[PDB]
Amino acid sequence: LTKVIAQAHIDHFTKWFERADKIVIVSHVSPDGDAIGSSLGLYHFLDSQDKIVNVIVPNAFPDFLKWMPGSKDILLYDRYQEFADKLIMEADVICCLDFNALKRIDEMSDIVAASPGRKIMIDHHLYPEDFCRITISHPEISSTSELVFRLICRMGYFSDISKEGAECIYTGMMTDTGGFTYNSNNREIYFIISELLSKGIDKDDIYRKVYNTYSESRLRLMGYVLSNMKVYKDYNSALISLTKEEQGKFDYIKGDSEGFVNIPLSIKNVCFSCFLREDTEMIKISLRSVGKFPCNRLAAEFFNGGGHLNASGGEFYGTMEEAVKVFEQALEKYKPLLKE
């Protein structure tokens, strides 16, 4: 309903749009629901508009996202670099969805930066770089998927949004809000949900296909991590872990411990959650927080990383109680902040 995107930007992109013949859509390393959804959504739109479109991500994406229309044709740069470089270098327009720093598409940086094709960035993360000639950056919006839906509507093609395109955009929105349980207080989100529903999607099904589909090993693996988690009541934090030794017990396939770092946050008075997953061999740190505790800050001040205010990670080389000690001092330092 409300105009969030600059009408100017919209007009300028519309110009590139009609002139363009070959468009390439790119997203960040380790594509997540919003990354794949927003890109597949734009892809479907652009594709119905008599245009050559190719979605290229740096990496592989979760299996719970394979059911999406078009995922099969998403080109993974780490296995077809050659082909991709050609597509990228020959593109008229290059849409960068869901990331605002070239370092984010790690590996693809060079070729994307090198391409003479005009670039446009549609994102919602804070502090956007200026490598794109057109920049649609709105941190005030919950997902890239959502403003890809706004951009298409503002351009007058709401009617041209297919059910497949609608399924993807909704997935991206759902994902970045954890099923609309955080950063979803804006009314318009629900007007859009209602509109997508009118394209024929089954939101309840999309939900199950992403969150309620996975081996009994993963769910049991979870039950394990939960029993062994440690809760530092006075620091309002919590820590869960997994050694290569443990991973082998439950036959850990990559992606099992997903969303595990979140579970601890559902405890009454625990707003900071840490997950130390011993990488096969040193320790993989994942930070999550409800409220305003800056995870990205402790992520950089103790585990050579970064990320966002509520979610971020990084690695610490050593062992289990070694990482734990590190985490435990990080806690002692921020104990007063963790108290506010």
Backbone angles phi, psi at 141, to 5 degrees: -105, 140
Binding residues among 250-269 for ligand 5GP as defined by CB under 6 A? 261
**Closer Cβ to ligand 5GP, 199 or 297, answer by number:** 297
Choose one: 39-47, 157-165, 204-212, 295-303; the region binding a second copy (CB under 8 A): 204-212
List 11, 306, 329, 337, residue binding ligand 5GP (CB under 6 A)? 306
Could you tell which of ligand 5GP, Mn ion, a second copy, none binds residue 38, using a CB distance below 5 to 8 A set by kind? none
Asked if residue 179 binds a second copy (CB under 8 A), the reply is yes
Q: Is 126 in the site for a second copy (CB under 8 A)?
A: no
255 binds a second copy (CB under 8 A): no
Q: Please check whether residue 59 is in contact with residue 76, taking contact to mean a CB–CB distance below 8 angstroms.
A: yes
**Burial grade of 47 (CB within 10 A; 0-12, 13-18, 19 or more):** middle
Amino acid at 207: Y
The entry of Mn ion, ligand 5GP, a second copy, none near residue 211 (CB within 5 to 8 angstroms by kind) is a second copy
Q: Give yes or no for a contact between 177 and 208, defined as CB atoms under 8 angstroms apart.
A: no
Residues 291-330 that bind Mn ion (CB under 5 A): none
How far, CA to CA in Å, does 18 sit from each of 13, 64, 231, 318? 9, 34, 56, 54
Q: Where are the beta strands (DSSP E) in 164-261?
A: 230-232, 237-242
- Cα gap 319→316, rounded to integer Å: 8
206 binds, among Mn ion, ligand 5GP, a second copy, none (CB under 5 to 8 A by kind): none
- When binding is defined by CB under 5 A, the residue of 85, 98, 256, 278 that contacts Mn ion is 98
Site string for Mn ion, 169-198 (x = CB under 5 A): -------x----------------------
* CA end-to-end distance (rounded Å), the chain: 37
- Cα–Cα distance list, 85 to 67, 107, 136, 234, 317 (Å): 27, 11, 25, 52, 34
By the rule CB under 8 A, 308 interacts with a second copy: no
Q: Which residue from 32, 47, 106, 328 is in contact with Mn ion, where contact means CB under 5 A?
A: 32
* 144 backbone φψ class: left, alpha, beta (φ>0; ψ -120 to 50): alpha
Per-residue tokens: 176: 């970045």
- Which residue ranges make up the site for Mn ion (CB under 5 A)? 32, 34-35, 98, 144, 176
- Which residue ranges make up the site for ligand 5GP (CB under 6 A)? 261, 286, 305-307, 311-314
- Which residue ranges make up the site for a second copy (CB under 8 A)? 179-188, 190-191, 193-194, 197-198, 202-204, 207-208, 211-216, 219-220, 222-229, 231, 233, 238, 263-268, 270, 290
